[PDB]
């Protein structure tokens, strides 16, 4: 009939949008966000949206990029007041350590000495310290790793590396949607959708080949990838059960320090008390055996019936991607994961060797490097696997078998495991309608 344009304001309609999110945390010095952010809402609200099928796509989620940039900038701030080690690039003559030692690959630990500067410009001192083979390159005469490629900064010993959960909250005019559907593969319409003011806290845990200290799947192991048929893509696997990791460093190392210049001091590994033994991490055999069987069953659903599934160690690449990185106590460990992936599937514990490196580059940036200070005493660290990163050696159509190897090298993929649940939308309050009416 005689229909007319009408206008409504406050209309409950939203559109896809990207905006800066405000960081907050539930949390003395720490490298993490607690210094750069504000307190959270003690009682977060959630509203279920009935009859809503809103589409999610984790692979396009901009929240991943926003977190990455905040984490990198956040981490860099912690090194700005800290000591520079530029004076330490020297001839560094070294010899083999001889002691009551079960050792490792021979030459792994070395006794080194160098001419070092003092508080006064007029004076020098002779010092010695222990170094790991990974941090030393032969020119006998030696150089520290990256002495010809980058400046090295010593991390301040007072600052903790222990992860602190980070929450993100919407600005006014925006809302964060959450997918509640169980067994969601990260894409397509979500059967159950709710709105939250803020996200659940996410810890910035850094690891390779395995995802540590994250969320678990609600019912069954979930396998997802940007493209399941493309062997190039990383496959993220979320476990529905925990598997622990027990790492230790038994050697009882000691720490000594010397003042360098008027404003700086250097910390180094001193004599080791007692027998010298290999650092290592345990993985339970029985638990892992069950865990693999569950993953294989789910893989068969994606890759078809009667395909023989095998696992193997990475064929190549840098230590960062061929080994499992840890940060325990501030010490950086690299472990050989072989024996976790050493299996074929058709139908009490494992001990992995580890190596310690004091010079690291967590974000793989060229021209950057950090020196961790040594930690005094024996270290024990207990954490758990909540997922895996896998890649295929396949893409071949000429076989009835398939093989998987660990992936890694991109930190953003770890955050996807917690952020796949969330989407950001903008609220558009204005709209119009046909209903018949009259006005003067």
């Amino acid at each position: 009939e005689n229909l007319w344009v009408t206008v409504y304001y406050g209309v409950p309609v939203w559109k896809d949008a990207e905006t800066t999110l405000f960081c907050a945390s539930d949390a003395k010095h720490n490298v993490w966000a607690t210094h750069a952010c504000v307190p959270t809402d003690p009682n977060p609200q959630e509203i279920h949206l009935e009859n809503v099928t809103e589409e999610f796509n984790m692979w396009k989620n901009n929240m991943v990029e926003q977190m990455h940039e905040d984490i990198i900038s956040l981490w860099d701030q912690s090194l700005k007041p800290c000591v520079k080690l530029t004076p330490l690039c020297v001839t560094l003559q070294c010899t083999n350590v001889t002691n009551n030692i079960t050792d490792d690959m021979r030459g792994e630990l070395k006794n080194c000495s160098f001419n070092m500067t003092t508080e006064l410009r007029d004076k020098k001192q002779k010092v010695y310290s222990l170094f790991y083979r990974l941090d030393v390159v032969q020119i006998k005469e030696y150089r520290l790793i990256n002495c010809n490629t980058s400046a090295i900064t010593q991390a301040c010993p007072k600052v903790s590396f222990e992860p602190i959960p980070i929450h993100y909250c919407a600005p006014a005019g925006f809302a964060i949607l959450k997918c509640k559907d169980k067994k969601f593969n990260g894409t397509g319409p979500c059967p159950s959708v709710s709105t939250v003011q803020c996200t659940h806290g996410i810890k910035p845990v850094v690891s390779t080949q395995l995802l540590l200290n994250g969320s678990l799947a609600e019912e069954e192991v979930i396998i997802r990838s940007e493209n399941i048929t493309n062997n190039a893509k990383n496959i993220l696997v979320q476990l529905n059960t925990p598997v622990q990791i027990n790492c230790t460093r038994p050697n009882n190392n000691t720490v000594k320090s010397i003042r360098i210049g008027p404003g700086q001091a250097f910390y180094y590994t001193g004599d080791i008390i007692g027998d010298i033994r290999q650092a290592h991490c345990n993985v339970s055999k029985a638990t892992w055996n069950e865990t693999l069987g569950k993953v294989v069953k789910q893989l068969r659903k994606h890759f078809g019936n009667n395909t023989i599934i095998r696992f193997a160690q990475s064929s190549g690449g840098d230590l960062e991607v061929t080994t499992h990185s840890f940060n325990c106590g501030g010490e950086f460990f690299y472990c050989n994961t072989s024996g976790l992936f050493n299996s074929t599937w058709i139908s009490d514990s494992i001990t992995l060797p580890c190596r310690i490196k004091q010079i690291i580059n967590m974000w793989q940036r060229i021209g950057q490097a950090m020196y961790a200070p040594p930690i005094q005493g024996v270290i024990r660290c207990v954490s758990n696997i909540t997922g895996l990163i896998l890649t295929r050696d396949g893409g071949s159509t000429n076989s009835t078998t398939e093989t998987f190897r660990p992936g890694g090298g991109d930190m953003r993929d770890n955050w996807r495991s917690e952020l796949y649940k969330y989407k950001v939308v903008k609220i558009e309050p204005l709209g119009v309608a046909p209903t018949r009416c009259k006005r003067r």
Partner: protein, 121 residues
Amino acid sequence: LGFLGAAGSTMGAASMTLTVQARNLLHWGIKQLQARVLAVEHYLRDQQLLGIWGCSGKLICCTNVPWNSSWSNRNLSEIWDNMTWLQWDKEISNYTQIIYGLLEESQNQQEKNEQDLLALD
């Protein structure tokens, strides 16, 4: 009854919550400020559209622009009682700029002149 709780409701039912929705519309230091400044600017721009239409005093208003029903062949009961606002926004997504242009030009321009003529005498 909470924010966006109306999303699953029919367009008619949703009208009960419009006021509730309105209340919620209003280095790192730079990023935070940019978000807040833009949120304010966006809010003000929507208010300007209403101010031109003369609808700024109300959440709900009528206009003098005819519906031109050929835009969508639906009955009022088919729209108001059987559909959400989310679905509706898609149905008229290609006509929104037209409707807004009609409101600013075909209504406000006639109304301001008639009111002025009455004021003059």
